[PDB]
Design a protein around this nucleic acid. Structure first.
Lengths: 279, 314, 136, 136
RNA sequence: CGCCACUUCAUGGAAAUAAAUCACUCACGAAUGUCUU
């Protein structure tokens, strides 16, 4: 009841700038986790974007998010927003346009987070994800692996000639886990996923500034690829029930699209937020 | 596999063009000078280019359908033949024979050719008077730039909407509201969530009967006509290909040459001294028509001066 | 990625040793674009295509582009000279032969992340080192 | 920390001496952003890359960005002038030569913990002293 | 009318630029001002 896990499905190339200076090729990098070095959204940015979406409902924002800055009455927000961590990232291939890529360490982190935070429907997900991770570890036996669960994706090149996909027939993929993580799922080793998600491999978009049709500036912007999945934790801090119901209804409505990150005017950070479906 | 891109049987076009293009194969050499000019290297690159230029796109594509669901009703325009080029400045070159020398703009996830929303926004803004920044270098051409573009914007607005007369300050306010979402200055207008202009990515929608990517040549002849030319091979979007432009546009309210919010304009209307002569309104449909006219006028992409990237109504 | 001061020192000596920096602490203005374009090519097309393009000696370019690949090789050699014993067990500490083609060295050693990371760090170091001197 | 009045005085004198503030107590607007961004660049990147970026002349910028590096060098020189010369002290009091770029000095004068501390303090003093003046 | 091919396969420019650099609130509140031998 208190804690729910929400999945973020991005519909365009999303950029949450870290704001730091990079003197290499990429001038603008994206936010990364302080521990795992994976792309993420700061909880402040998530809360700001969601508050911007709900700004019209003044009572709901005041009860859930808190008081507006520099208001005379500073009242704390009741709902607690946790940072969104990368769940699945699309990887380019030769057999299919893109595949859903997740590492064993990402799965273990998700299992640990569900154990610690005690999500609403966490028990079945933890059980099945632990079973899947144990099967993957048994099959790998300490080596690098790229495991697909579709027999047609055998021998697929996951963005790099070194990484080739093998299909272990013994390991089953439950349909709810497929829905959570994504179709055409590949389980990568930590080394492979770190290589595929580092600064030399993440997609970059080139932009230039034109003055009377002549280029004045030029820079590269790192982006999180479209259709990437991130999970964040929402804690119900004794907030009012009806406002909470309205919040979850609007948030999980299929017609709802939320903008998170930078470059809103050029259609960058548009996402769909989904709740953890019961298993 | 070879045609009809889809999501189940395809190779990521950006992947093929950038990462898999220069894969190291047995008996294929392009490190040495002899290898780069050899016929084996030319055959290798010819096969790679043929793989690139064999994919079609159906109108009922689940990718394009998902794009339509996410970003709304598209603006469908059709490519004419010089071709269409996007991302020409992306580095893709080694010095070999039969390879694509210029870059191409591919979506990372889907792999489809696309035009980033930044490109569309900049192209549309370039035909507005206040696109050029007031700077020391630009101050020589600054007056003529705005003078020429303001007339064009005026006729286009009078064409697309019912407004009989528009002022220079009104045009400035409209431009800064559409592109900057602010006032001409640095002031912010209290806008609602829906009162924002968003320029999504233009995607290739449907190649009716044929592939969507073709190969083209630009062959510069140097300043010496007695020297040999220089064949440059690049990848272009084929003519007769449907491009889907996605926008999120709102209604702009102008009262006394200033941009007003929707609730602001409601309050202004409710007042006693409401002059209907000073009230102007451009709707989202009229904004779309304005953008369509701009696109049909100048086009989008690279080498637009020499014809590339011109569009016709579907 | 943080560029160390020793990497910038290596870049300075490599740019002097090949002949990017003249005796009066000046360099031709086109090498700036050369190094920036090499970084962009590495990030976009890949390590091997960029190395092959900028390694070519039969160019129509204004200046000697292959000298930037030479500077790359010298910087990588200097970096590998200071690899620790425990680093040599994980990382390849062998010196790249002077006359060896860099592209074929990378190909024969694979496409390992070590070489790509070293190339990117050395390219950033070269850019920073050129930023310290005057463009003719 | 707390604001050091002597460092603020040094910053005032260096800003006047490096032709940042005109005869009227006024400065070009972009220098505020320059001073503010210098500290963030120093923290996020290395000290050497930040000093290279800001000391770089012939750049494409709205004003003379290397003037802030000149101001920093003048402030560091004043601090080293005021340093107490006693045994069992850590700070080295030798001044930075006027013919020396700051990048070169930091390059060949490593173990730069003292230099890092001085540069951060001088940046803070510059930021706080620039507020006495008006931006055009 | 017959017979017959060679040549050329990227250079130059832009490689980040400005705005915001913490803001508001709380800055001590209550008890004890002598007590027991």
């Amino acid at each position: 009841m208190t804690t729910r896990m929400y999945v973020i499905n991005t519909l365009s190339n999303m950029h949450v700038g870290s704001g730091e200076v990079n003197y290499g090729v990429i001038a603008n990098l994206i936010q990364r986790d302080s521990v795992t070095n994976l792309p993420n959204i700061n909880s402040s940015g998530l809360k700001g974007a969601i508050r911007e979406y709900f700004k019209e409902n003044e009572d709901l924002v005041r009860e859930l998010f808190g008081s507006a800055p520099r208001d005379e009455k500073t009242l704390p927000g009741k709902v607690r927003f946790f940072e969104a961590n990368l769940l699945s990232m699309p990887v380019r291939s030769d057999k299919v346009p893109f595949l859903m890529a997740i590492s064993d360490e990402v799965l273990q982190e998700l299992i640990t987070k569900m154990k610690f935070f005690n999500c609403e429907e966490a028990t079945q997900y933890i059980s099945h994800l632990s079973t899947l991770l144990d099967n993957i570890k048994t099959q790998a036996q300490g080596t690098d692996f790229a495991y697909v669960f579709d027999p047609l994706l055998q021998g697929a090149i996951i963005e790099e000639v070194s990484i080739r996909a093998t299909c272990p027939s013994h390991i089953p993929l439950q349909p709810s886990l497929k829905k959570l993580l994504g179709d055409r799922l590949v389980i990568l080793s930590h080394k492979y996923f770190s290589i595929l998600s580092d600064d030399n491999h993440l997609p970059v978009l080139s932009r230039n500034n034109l003055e009377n049709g002549q280029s004045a500036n030029l820079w590269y912007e790192q982006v999180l690829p479209r259709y990437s999945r991130l999970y964040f934790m929402l804690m119900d801090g004794n907030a009012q029930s009806e406002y909470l119901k309205k919040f979850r209804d609007t948030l999980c409505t299929p017609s709802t699209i939320i903008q998170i990150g930078a470059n809103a005017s050029i259609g960058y950070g548009y996402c769909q937020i989904s709740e953890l479906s019961p298993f | 596999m070879p045609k009809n891109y889809t999501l189940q049987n395809a190779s990521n076009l950006g992947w093929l063009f950038y990462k898999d293009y220069y894969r190291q194969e047995p008996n294929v050499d392009f490190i040495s000078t002899q290898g780069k000019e050899s016929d084996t290297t030319a055959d290798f690159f010819r096969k790679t280019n043929q793989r690139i230029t064999a994919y079609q796109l159906n109108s009922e594509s689940p990718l394009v359908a998902a794009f339509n669901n996410h970003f709304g009703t598209p603006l469908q325009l059709k490519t004419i033949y010089p071709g269409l080029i996007t991302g020409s400045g992306l580095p893709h070159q080694t010095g070999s024979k039969g390879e694509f020398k210029l870059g191409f703009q591919f979506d990372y996830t889907t792999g489809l050719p696309y035009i980033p929303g930044s490109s569309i926004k900049g192209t549309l803004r370039s035909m507005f008077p206040f696109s050029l920044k007031d700077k020391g270098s630009t101050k020589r051409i600054l007056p003529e730039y705005r003078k020429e573009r303001m007339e064009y914007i005026r006729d286009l607005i009078i064409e697309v909407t019912n407004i009989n007369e528009i002022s220079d300050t009104e045009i400035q306010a409209l431009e800064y509201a559409i592109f900057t979402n602010s006032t001409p200055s640095g002031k912010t207008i209290e806008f609602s969530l829906e009162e924002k202009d968003v320029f999504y990515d233009a995607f290739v929608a449907d190649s009716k009967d044929g592939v969507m990517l073709s190969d083209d040549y630009i062959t510069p002849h140097g300043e010496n006509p007695l020297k040999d030319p220089k064949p440059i091979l690049f990848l272009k979007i084929r003519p007769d290909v449907t491009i889907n432009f996605y926008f999120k546009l709102c209604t702009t309210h102008l009262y006394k040459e200033k941009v007003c919010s929707s609730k602001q304009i409601e309050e202004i209307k409710k007042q006693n001294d409401f002059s209907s002569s000073d009230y102007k309104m451009i709707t989202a449909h009229q904004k779309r028509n304005l953008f369509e006219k701009i696109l049909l006028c100048i086009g989008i992409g690279a080498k637009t001066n020499i014809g590339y990237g011109q569009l016709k109504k579907l | 990625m943080k560029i160390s001061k020793k990497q910038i020192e290596y870049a300075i000596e490599a740019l002097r040793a090949n002949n990017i920096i003249t005796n009066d602490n000046q360099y031709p203005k086109v090498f700036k674009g050369y190094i920036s374009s090499f970084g962009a090519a590495v990030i976009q097309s890949g390590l091997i295509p960029a190395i092959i393009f900028f390694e070519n000696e039969d160019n129509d370019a204004n200046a000697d582009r292959h000298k930037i690949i030479g500077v790359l090789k010298d910087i990588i050699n200097a970096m590998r000279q200071q690899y620790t014993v425990t680093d040599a067990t994980i990382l390849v500490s062998s010196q790249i032969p002077a006359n060896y083609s860099m592209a074929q060295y990378i190909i024969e050693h694979g496409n390992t992340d070590q070489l790509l990371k070293e190339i990117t760090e050395a390219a950033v170091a070269m850019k920073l080192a050129l930023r310290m001197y005057k463009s003719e």
